[PDB]
Amino acid sequence: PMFVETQASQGQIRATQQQHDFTLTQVVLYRSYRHGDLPD
Amino acid sequence: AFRDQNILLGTTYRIIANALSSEPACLAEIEEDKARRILELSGSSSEDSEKVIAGLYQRAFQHLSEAVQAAEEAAGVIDAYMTLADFCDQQLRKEEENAELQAYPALVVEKMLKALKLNSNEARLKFPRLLQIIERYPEETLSLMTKEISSVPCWQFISWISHMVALLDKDQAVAVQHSVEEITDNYPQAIVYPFIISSESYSFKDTSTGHKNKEFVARIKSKLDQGGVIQDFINALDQLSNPELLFKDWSNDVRAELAKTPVNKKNIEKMYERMYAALGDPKAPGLGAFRRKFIQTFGKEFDKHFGKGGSKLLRMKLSDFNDITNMLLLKMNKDSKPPGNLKECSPWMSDFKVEFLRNELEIPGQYDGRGKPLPEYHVRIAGFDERVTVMASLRRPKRIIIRGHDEREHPFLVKGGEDLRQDQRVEQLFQVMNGILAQDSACSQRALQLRTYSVVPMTSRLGLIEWLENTVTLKDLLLNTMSQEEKAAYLSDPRAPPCEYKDWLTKMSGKHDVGAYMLMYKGANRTETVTSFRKRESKVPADLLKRAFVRMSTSPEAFLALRSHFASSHALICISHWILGIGDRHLNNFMVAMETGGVIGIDFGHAFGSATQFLPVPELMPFRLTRQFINLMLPMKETGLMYSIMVHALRAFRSDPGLLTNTMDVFVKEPSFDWKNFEQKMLKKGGSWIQEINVAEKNWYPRQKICYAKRKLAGANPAVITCDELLLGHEKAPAFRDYVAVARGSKDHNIRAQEPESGLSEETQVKCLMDQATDPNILGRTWEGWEPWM
Amino acid sequence: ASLAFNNIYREFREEESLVEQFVFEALVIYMESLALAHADEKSLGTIQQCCDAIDHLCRIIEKKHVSLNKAKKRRLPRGFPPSASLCLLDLVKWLLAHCGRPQTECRHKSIELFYKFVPLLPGNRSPNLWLKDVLKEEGVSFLINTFEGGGCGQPSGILAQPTLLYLRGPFSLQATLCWLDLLLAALECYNTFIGERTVGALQVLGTEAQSSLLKAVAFFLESIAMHDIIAAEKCNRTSPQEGERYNYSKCTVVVRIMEFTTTLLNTSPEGWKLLKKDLCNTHLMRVLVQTLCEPASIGFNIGDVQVMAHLPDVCVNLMKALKMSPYKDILETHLREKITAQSIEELCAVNLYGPDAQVDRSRLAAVVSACKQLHRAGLLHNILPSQSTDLHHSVGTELLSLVYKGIAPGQCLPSLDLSCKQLASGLLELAFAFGGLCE
Numbered sequence A: 001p002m003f004v005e006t007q008a009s010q011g012q013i014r015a016t017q018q019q020h021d022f023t024l025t026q027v028v029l030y031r032s033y034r035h036g037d038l039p040d
Numbered sequence B: 001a002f003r004d005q006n007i008l009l010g011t012t013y014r015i016i017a018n019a020l021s022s023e024p025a026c027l028a029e030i031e032e033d034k035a036r037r038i039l040e041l042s043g044s045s046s047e048d049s050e051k052v053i054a055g056l057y058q059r060a061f062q063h064l065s066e067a068v069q070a071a072e073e074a075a076g077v078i079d080a081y082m083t084l085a086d087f088c089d090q091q092l093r094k095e096e097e098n099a100e101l102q103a104y105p106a107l108v109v110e111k112m113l114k115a116l117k118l119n120s121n122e123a124r125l126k127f128p129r130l131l132q133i134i135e136r137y138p139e140e141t142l143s144l145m146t147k148e149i150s151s152v153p154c155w156q157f158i159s160w161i162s163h164m165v166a167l168l169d170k171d172q173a174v175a176v177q178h179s180v181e182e183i184t185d186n187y188p189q190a191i192v193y194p195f196i197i198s199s200e201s202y203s204f205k206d207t208s209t210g211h212k213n214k215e216f217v218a219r220i221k222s223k224l225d226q227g228g229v230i231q232d233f234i235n236a237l238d239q240l241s242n243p244e245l246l247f248k249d250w251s252n253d254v255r256a257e258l259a260k261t262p263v264n265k266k267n268i269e270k271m272y273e274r275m276y277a278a279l280g281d282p283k284a285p286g287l288g289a290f291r292r293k294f295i296q297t298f299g300k301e302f303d304k305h306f307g308k309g310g311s312k313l314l315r316m317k318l319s320d321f322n323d324i325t326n327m328l329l330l331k332m333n334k335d336s337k338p339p340g341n342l343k344e345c346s347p348w349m350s351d352f353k354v355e356f357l358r359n360e361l362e363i364p365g366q367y368d369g370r371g372k373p374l375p376e377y378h379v380r381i382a383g384f385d386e387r388v389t390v391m392a393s394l395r396r397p398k399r400i401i402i403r404g405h406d407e408r409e410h411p412f413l414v415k416g417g418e419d420l421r422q423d424q425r426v427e428q429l430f431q432v433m434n435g436i437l438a439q440d441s442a443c444s445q446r447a448l449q450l451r452t453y454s455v456v457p458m459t460s461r462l463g464l465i466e467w468l469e470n471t472v473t474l475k476d477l478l479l480n481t482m483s484q485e486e487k488a489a490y491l492s493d494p495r496a497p498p499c500e501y502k503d504w505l506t507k508m509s510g511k512h513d514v515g516a517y518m519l520m521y522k523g524a525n526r527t528e529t530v531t532s533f534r535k536r537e538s539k540v541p542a543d544l545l546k547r548a549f550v551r552m553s554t555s556p557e558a559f560l561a562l563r564s565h566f567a568s569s570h571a572l573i574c575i576s577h578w579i580l581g582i583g584d585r586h587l588n589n590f591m592v593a594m595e596t597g598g599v600i601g602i603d604f605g606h607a608f609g610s611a612t613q614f615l616p617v618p619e620l621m622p623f624r625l626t627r628q629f630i631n632l633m634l635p636m637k638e639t640g641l642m643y644s645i646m647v648h649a650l651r652a653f654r655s656d657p658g659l660l661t662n663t664m665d666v667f668v669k670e671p672s673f674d675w676k677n678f679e680q681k682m683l684k685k686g687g688s689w690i691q692e693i694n695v696a697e698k699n700w701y702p703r704q705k706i707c708y709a710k711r712k713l714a715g716a717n718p719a720v721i722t723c724d725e726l727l728l729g730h731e732k733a734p735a736f737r738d739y740v741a742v743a744r745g746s747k748d749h750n751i752r753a754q755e756p757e758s759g760l761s762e763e764t765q766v767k768c769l770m771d772q773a774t775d776p777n778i779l780g781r782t783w784e785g786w787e788p789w790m
Numbered sequence C: 001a002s003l004a005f006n007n008i009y010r011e012f013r014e015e016e017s018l019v020e021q022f023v024f025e026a027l028v029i030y031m032e033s034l035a036l037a038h039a040d041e042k043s044l045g046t047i048q049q050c051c052d053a054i055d056h057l058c059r060i061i062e063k064k065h066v067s068l069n070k071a072k073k074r075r076l077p078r079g080f081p082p083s084a085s086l087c088l089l090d091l092v093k094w095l096l097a098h099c100g101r102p103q104t105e106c107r108h109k110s111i112e113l114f115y116k117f118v119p120l121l122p123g124n125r126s127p128n129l130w131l132k133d134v135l136k137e138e139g140v141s142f143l144i145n146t147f148e149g150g151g152c153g154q155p156s157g158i159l160a161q162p163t164l165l166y167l168r169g170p171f172s173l174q175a176t177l178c179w180l181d182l183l184l185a186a187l188e189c190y191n192t193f194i195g196e197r198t199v200g201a202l203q204v205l206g207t208e209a210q211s212s213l214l215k216a217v218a219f220f221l222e223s224i225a226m227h228d229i230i231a232a233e234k235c236n237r238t239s240p241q242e243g244e245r246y247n248y249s250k251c252t253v254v255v256r257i258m259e260f261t262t263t264l265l266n267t268s269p270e271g272w273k274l275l276k277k278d279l280c281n282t283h284l285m286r287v288l289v290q291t292l293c294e295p296a297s298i299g300f301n302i303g304d305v306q307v308m309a310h311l312p313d314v315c316v317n318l319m320k321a322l323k324m325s326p327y328k329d330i331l332e333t334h335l336r337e338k339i340t341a342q343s344i345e346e347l348c349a350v351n352l353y354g355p356d357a358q359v360d361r362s363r364l365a366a367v368v369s370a371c372k373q374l375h376r377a378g379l380l381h382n383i384l385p386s387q388s389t390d391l392h393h394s395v396g397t398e399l400l401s402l403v404y405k406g407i408a409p410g411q412c413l414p415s416l417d418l419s420c421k422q423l424a425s426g427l428l429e430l431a432f433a434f435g436g437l438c439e
C-alpha cells in the first residue's frame, strides 16, 4: 500500500548557501555535481 | 461394560435393519439358515420384510434406550446419548421423507441437549436439527426444549447464533430467548452483527405471543446499542462503497419490483427513501468528500425525475424508467473516481481516537464458537491505516488496514452491495469439512486441510472479508509468467484462443450472442469440437505453471515443495467443491499463495450445482482440471498425486456423512438462500446471464438439491447427477437432448458412460470424475469467459 | 516518528512553502501522539521525544508568526473541519478546546502552548483580553464545558461524571483511575487559568453554572481522599502494584487540590465564601492536618524524595494562604488537637539510645518535620507558647539539654545508630528554629 495522492481540488541542483534564518541551538544559487554526490 | 454392550448390540441391530432396507431382496438371496436366523431374531413372524425391519428397529431402540438408562450412574456417557439421539433422528428423517415414531422427537431433543451440556462437538454441530425439529413437532417439544436449554452453557451457541435471531420472530421464540439474552449479557459482540442483519426482517405477528416477542426484541436492541458505536462503524464502512454502484443496485431492486403491476407503491416509497437517505440528502450522518462530490453532482436530478417525496416516479413507465437510469449511468460510469486516502472517503475512520472509557470495537469475526470465549485476548480496533486500495473489478471492493491494539496490523476487504451470508455459511461448511478431514487417519497423515478465510456480514449490502496476504490470483499468475510476446500475442491477436473461440461459435451458429450455444450444442458433432478444441488449445504455451513455479522458487527442493503443495491443495479443493457442487470455477476464482504454493478458493456464488442448473449455457464439469493442471505434474500421469488425494478425501467424507449432510441441510433450508436472493445476486454480476426470460420463478426447490448431494456422497455416477440436475433447469430448452448427450459421455471415449449409475466406489467415482472434467467434448463447448483452454 | 522529526526540524524550518503548508498538521498529530504516549512506561523516553518535537515546532511557529495566522489554503490536520483557509487562531481554538484532556503531559503541553499562542495573534492583546472577548461572545459555560469536559470529543469528564457512583459497573480498578485523571485534568486547567490571571475567580464557579468541580472535590474529600485503604473506592483482593499506583494517583490529586485552594484564596479575597459550604470543614482540614502530622498514613511514599521535596512548600503556602483569612480559627482548631504541649512531652520520654529502640523513634521524625514545616510557615509560637517563665524558652533549650545529657556516660555509653542522627539533626534544627539562641 503506497500513498496514492490527493483527489484534485475544485546548473542542476541548488548550492549550499551559508546564510540562515533561524538561529542555532545553545534568490538562491545553483551548482553542479562534484564527484562525491552520486554513486560512482 | 453393560452400557457399552447395549450400545454395540443396538448398533448391530441398526446395521442389519439398515442393510435389509437398502435392498430388500438380498434377504431372499443369502441362505435358508441365515434368513430364518434373522426372522427369528427380530421376533416378529410375518415374512413380509417390512414388519421384520420394524421389529429389528424396535429391538435396536430397546437396546439403545437401555444403554442410555445405564449411562446415568466425558467419553462414554455422551457416546451413549449420541447413539440414541442420532438413531432416533435418522428414523425421524426416514419417516419425514415419505405412530411408531411417537416418542422420538422428545427423545432426540432431550438426549442431544444433555450431550451438549457435557461439552460435545458432534452434538454442538448437530444443534440446528433441534431448531428444525421444534417447528415440525411443536407439541412434544416446546417447553421441554425450553426447560432443558435453560441450563446449557451460553457460549455453546455462538457458531449457530445466526439461526436463533432468525428464529426470534416465530411461534417458538421462548425456546431460545433465554440463551439469546445470556449471550447479550456475557459476550455482546458475538451477537451484534447477526442481530443487526436480522432486525431488517422480522414482521411481528399480532397475538399475545408476538407482542411479547416484540417486547423482547426491543429489549435486546436497547441492550446492544452500547453507546451506538457499532452503527457508526457500520455507517463509516458503508461510506467506502461506490455511489454509482449503489444507484445501479437500487435501479435493480426497483425495476424488478415495479415490473409487477398493480405495483402497490407502499414498498416503492420505502425503497426510494432508502435511496435518498444515502445518495440524496446531502446534510447527512457524516459522509466524506467522495460521496459529497457525488451528491453535489447528482442529487438535484433525483427530484427532477423521482420527486421530492417520491410519488413522481409513480407513473411506472417500465421502459422509460430504464431510460432514466441509463441517462444517469452513461455519465455515472465516467464522472466518479475512487479515492485512495481514507480521509477523502470516511472521516470517522480518519479521525478514530479510541475514547476514554466508552466501549470497544472488537475486530469482527473473532468468536468462532468452540470452547470458552475469553474475550480478554480478543483484538480491539485502535485505528485505521490511511491507505485504501481499490481492487480492479466491476464491483470494486476497497482494502482497508485496521491497526489492532495488540501491536499488529490486519487487512480486510470491505465490499458493499452484496449479501455475504452465503459466503459465510460456505466457509462454515468448510470448517465442518476439514474438521472431518482431521479425524481421518489417511487424511491427517497427509495433513489435508482446506484453506479457510473468515467472512463477516455486518449487515445486508455491507461486509468484511479477511485479506489473505502474499497471494495472487491464478489468472494473474499465468499471465505474469507469460513473456511479452506470449502475453500480447494471447491478448491482441485474432488467432488467439479468446478471439478464435468466438469465431468458431459464429462459425457453428451464425450469431454473436449467448444463443450461439443452443445451436452449437446441436450443430457440432463430437469430432469437430474435439479437433477445434485442440487447435485452440495448442496456441497457449504448454507449461505455464511449471515455469511459474521455477521462476518463483530458488532451489529444486523449493520447487518440489511448491509443486507438491499446489497439487495436494488443488486436488483437495477440487473434491470438496464437488460435494457441495460449487460451480463457476474460472481462473480468477482461485488464489495461489506465493510463498507456500497452496490454492485458496474464493467467490462462492453458485452453491449446489446451480451452475449446471440455472445458467443459459450450463457448466457440465465437476471442477477445474484444464491442461495447465495436468501439464504441471508431467511426466507423472493423472493416477499420481491428485488422484490419491481425491480418493482419500472422498473416502474420508463418505465414511460418515451424518455430520455433513445435516449441515448441508440447514444451509440449504435457509430462507435467505432462495430464488429472490439468487436472482438479485446474479444481477449485479454481469456473468453468464444478464436477464431472466423464465417461466414462473424457475422452480427453485431445495427438496432435492440435498437429495442430489446425499446421492453423490452415497455413491453415484457423477455424470448421472449432471443430467439429473440440468433436467431440473433445461427441460424446456431446445438442446436438452444434446446437453444430456454431451454430459453422459459416449460408451466409447469416456469412463463415465462405461459405469453403472450408482453403487460406485471411491476409486471408481474419482476415476469417472476426473474423466468428465478433462473431456474435450465438454471443455470445447463450455462458456467463453471460463477459459477452458488454460 | 519523533526521532525522525528531531533530526529534520533544522531543515524543515528552513523553507517557507514547506513550513506554510505542513506545520499545523505536524503540530496537531504530535500533540496526539504524545497523548497516546500517556499509556506506556516512563523509561522508553517516547514522551520526552514528543515534547522535544513539540517544542521544536513551537519555536518554528514563534519565529514565523506573522505569516501563519494569515488566512491561506493550508493542509488540514486530523479532526479539523473543512474550511476555505487556515490560520493560527483556529489552532489556538483547537488548543483551548483540548485543554482538559485526561492524558497528563499532553494536557500540560496544550496549556502552555495556548499561553504561548494567545500572543502572536493579530492585535497582540494579553490572554486576559482575548479570553474575555470570547467569553463575551460564546458564553461562560462554553469555557466550563472545555475545562470540565474531558478532551472535546465525547461529552464526558466530571461535568458528565461528578462522582464515582455515576461511573459504576463491576469493579474495575483502572476505571477509577480514569475518573481521577478526569478530575485531575479539570483541577489543573482551573488552577492554571486562575493562577496566571486571565479569568475571574468568582465569575467562573459562581452564580448560574453547572461547574461540577466543587461537587467533585467535595465527593473526593468526603470519602475518597483520606482513607485510601483501597476498599474505600470499591464500594475483592488487592496487590501492591494495583494499590501503589492508586496511592500515587491519589496523592498527586490531593497535592493539586491543595495548590488549587491556595490559588483560590490568594486570587479573590471576597471569594473565600465559595470554599465555605464544602471545603473548609472537617474534610479538607482533616486531610491537611493528616498530611502535616503524618503524610505516609494517607498514602505517600518515603522513598520518593522529590515529592517529599514538594510537599513542604505546598502545605507551607496553603497554611500561609489561609493565615490571612476567616479560616485562621478553623486552622487553629484542627491544628491544636494533634499539636499540643503534652503532644511533645509525650514523645520526649522515650529511651532514645538503644540498639533496637525504634519504638517511637520511627514516629518522632514525622512530628519533627511537622514542627519544622510549621515553623517555616511561621506559626510555631502561635501553636506553642512559652510556658516556663518568659521569652527564655522552655523546650527551645530543653531539647538541647536532652540531646546534651543523652550522650552522658551513665550503661557505659550511648553509641549511635542510623536514625538517631536523623532524629537528632531534626531536634537540633527545631531547637535552633525556636528563635535566637546562638549564645
Ligand SMILES: Nc1ncnc2c1ncn2[C@@H]1O[C@H](COP(=O)(O)OP(=O)(O)OP(=O)(O)O)[C@@H](O)[C@H]1O
Pocket: B391, B393, B394, B395, B396, B397, B413, B415, B453, B465, B466, B467, B468, B469, B471, B472, B473, B588, B589, B602, B603
Ligand atoms: N479473501 C481475499 N483475500 C485477498 N484477496 C482477495 C480476497 N477476495 C478477493 N480478493 C481479490 O479481489 C479480487 C476481486 O475479488 P471479488 O471476488 O470481490 O471480485 P468480483 O467482482 O467477484 O470479480 P471476480 O469474480 O473476477 O473476482 C480478486 O481477483 C482477488 O485478487
Ligand SMILES: [Mg+2]
Pocket: B588, B589, B602, B603
Ligand atoms: Mg470471483
